[PDB]
């Protein structure tokens with residue numbers, strides 16, 4: 001029943017050249033990462049009003065025909081090459097959530113990872129421009145807008161851990177990042193399908209069960225409806241909503257790299273009967289990216305943990321999350 005301490009951090013110095021100001025932001029990122037694991041990034045410079053409005057226009061105007069045409073393999077056997085990118089359909093009376101996922105716009109048929117058929121790389125699919133004017137242009141621009149914000153946040157995390165500010169960001173590149181945007185619609189439904197509600201061990205009704213994120217960090221915009229909870233030793237705590245800020249947390253690749261110094265917080269989504277948006281950007285590195293693990297608690301930083309290539313981590317992590325928490 002209690003509320004999580006989720007600080008609001010002004011991240012604007014991370015876009016600048018005042019090095020001491022950057023360190024003061026890094027200290028706040030460190031403090032939040034060692035407490036509940038969540039913070040809100042404010043003063044981030046992204047037009048989140050336009051994001052929410054264009055996402056709503058898309059979700060509310062797409063038709064069943066278009067959803068089949070864009071559907072991932074789980075919903076359309078014809079689309080064997082769409083495991084990640086495309087439309088994730090709701091199932092009326094059974095499954096409420098629906099979403100649209102897209103990847104690096106630089107993944108084209110020309111791209112070498114696409115020509116090589118490397119797992120987790122796909123070419124995006126888009127709706128018809130004449131039915132959804134300007135949607136693809138908006139979505140591709142948004143990808144690079146939130147890429148820029150994430151690059152800045154990664155400098156803060158690096159400084160927080162005592163590393164040079166490009167320690168993570170040097171692996172986060174426009175030509176090969178596996179980062180994804182997911183545009184999730186959580187609808188208002190009356191009656192709400194009981195099959196779409198899960199009951200937690202503690203009795204709480206949920207839309208999505210406990211999990212750690214498959215990411216380096218997760219950069220999340222949500223509309224102003226409270227839904228997230230974070231697990232602490234004393235139980236789950238509510239995360240207050242803020243539809244002007246981005247909610248940030250670490251994923252399990254950060255926990256691995258840091259020998260669990262920055263844990264990947266376990267969190268879950270409460271069931272709320274309300275029309276709302278959940279728009280995550282999953283900060284993923286490149287397929288071949290490897291960061292040597294270190295232990296910030298040790299003077300010498302020595303860690304015995306194996307370096308893990310990001311591509312293998314991502315492939316395994318996405319499948320495991322489907323197996324554990326269900327096809328979304």
Ligand SMILES: CC(C)[C@@H](NC(=O)[C@H](CS)NC(=O)CCC[C@H](N)C(=O)O)C(=O)O
Nearest residue numbers: 084101180182184208213269278280282328
């Ligand atoms: C908790 C939110 C981030 C959101 N949940 C989610 O987005 C959940 C848990 S982090 N994430 C996923 O299912 C992984 C999507 C990965 C994506 N298809 C890809 O190929 O990269 C929700 O609102 O349900």
Ligand SMILES: [Fe+3]
Nearest residue numbers: 211212213267
């Ligand atoms: Fe999550």
